[PDB]
Design an enzyme around this catalytic site. Structure first.
Site, mmCIF file in Angstrom:
data_model
loop_
_atom_site.group_PDB
_atom_site.id
_atom_site.type_symbol
_atom_site.label_atom_id
_atom_site.label_comp_id
_atom_site.label_asym_id
_atom_site.label_seq_id
_atom_site.Cartn_x
_atom_site.Cartn_y
_atom_site.Cartn_z
ATOM 1 N N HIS A 35 -3.107 -5.298 0.756
ATOM 2 C CA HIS A 35 -3.099 -3.830 0.616
ATOM 3 C C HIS A 35 -1.891 -3.430 -0.216
ATOM 4 O O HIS A 35 -0.862 -4.102 -0.206
ATOM 5 C CB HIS A 35 -3.017 -3.200 2.003
ATOM 6 C CG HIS A 35 -3.612 -1.825 2.090
ATOM 7 N ND1 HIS A 35 -4.943 -1.614 2.056
ATOM 8 C CD2 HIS A 35 -3.017 -0.574 2.260
ATOM 9 C CE1 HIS A 35 -5.198 -0.306 2.228
ATOM 10 N NE2 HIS A 35 -4.014 0.340 2.310
ATOM 11 N N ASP A 40 -6.282 -8.515 1.940
ATOM 12 C CA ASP A 40 -6.081 -7.267 2.675
ATOM 13 C C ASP A 40 -6.592 -7.407 4.108
ATOM 14 O O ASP A 40 -7.772 -7.585 4.332
ATOM 15 C CB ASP A 40 -6.797 -6.129 1.938
ATOM 16 C CG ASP A 40 -6.397 -4.746 2.447
ATOM 17 O OD1 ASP A 40 -5.952 -4.609 3.612
ATOM 18 O OD2 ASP A 40 -6.609 -3.773 1.689
#
Length: 233
Positions: free
Chosen positions: A202, A171
């Site tokens: 994400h 992420d």
């Protein structure tokens, strides 16, 4: 999409709608679902559906209603993504936590409720899930890939009920040093769990994301279900 007629009043008198799924069989624990940055949209309806299939009731409140009621943005549409980012930037986190508090209270005493309430949040909702965990409003809280968790670590000792977090190792919001701060900070409170999914970034639990990773989604989701299960009668 929201369930017509549902209206929940917040601390300051602001009212908001919600997408509600009653349980297959009552009574049941109720899960309040905290949205991503896109309002109450397809992934929220899919998540309500899933949790109902798993023996819960679910309530997904309209958290952008302070800015614009009934926002439901398609995360594959560039122009709607731009509006999502603008709503997120303007979002009042504290008022968000207050609206979630009111949704949690609503969830406690619906006709179908067994009186236990969980929260599951994604992205923006994952950040909110940590703040809610620090307030202690729910029996159990779960967050997927909240942003800025490394900035909230002073709240770790406030957490008095179990909370579980699923973070994507890739992420871009969470560089290595932030992951280290979160890992060390969380380790101080055994009521907190955080798992890292090394091959995921994400939004990894949403099929429509370019960042979807089925193996990470599935492992995180079964962990979420095993973590929520003690709420069930």
């Amino acid at each position: 999409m929201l369930t017509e007629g549902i209206s929940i009043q917040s601390y300051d008198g602001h009212t908001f709608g919600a997408l509600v799924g009653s349980p297959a069989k009552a009574p049941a624990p109720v899960i309040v679902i905290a949205q991503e940055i896109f309002g109450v949209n397809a992934f929220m309806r899919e998540t309500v559906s899933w949790l109902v299939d798993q023996g819960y009731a679910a309530v997904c409140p309209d958290l952008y209603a302070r800015q614009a009621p009934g926002t439901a943005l398609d995360p594959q549409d560039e122009r709607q993504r731009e509006q999502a980012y603008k709503l997120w930037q303007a979002f009042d986190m504290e008022a968000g936590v207050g609206d979630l508090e009111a949704a949690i209270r609503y969830a406690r005493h619906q006709p179908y409720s067994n009186g236990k309430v969980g929260l599951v949040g994604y992205s923006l909702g994952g950040a909110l899930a940590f703040l809610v965990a620090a307030k202690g409003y729910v029996d159990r809280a779960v967050g997927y890939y909240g942003v800025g968790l490394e900035k909230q670590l002073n709240k770790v000792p406030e957490v008095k009920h179990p909370a579980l977090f699923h973070m994507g190792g890739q992420d871009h919001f969470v560089p290595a040093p932030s992951r280290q701060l979160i890992t060390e900070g969380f380790g101080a409170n055994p009521l907190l769990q955080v798992h890292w999914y090394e091959e995921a970034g994400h939004s990894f639990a949403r099929t429509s994301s370019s960042g979807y990773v089925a193996s990470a989604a599935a492992l995180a989701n079964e962990r979420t279900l095993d973590f929520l299960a003690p709420l069930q009668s």
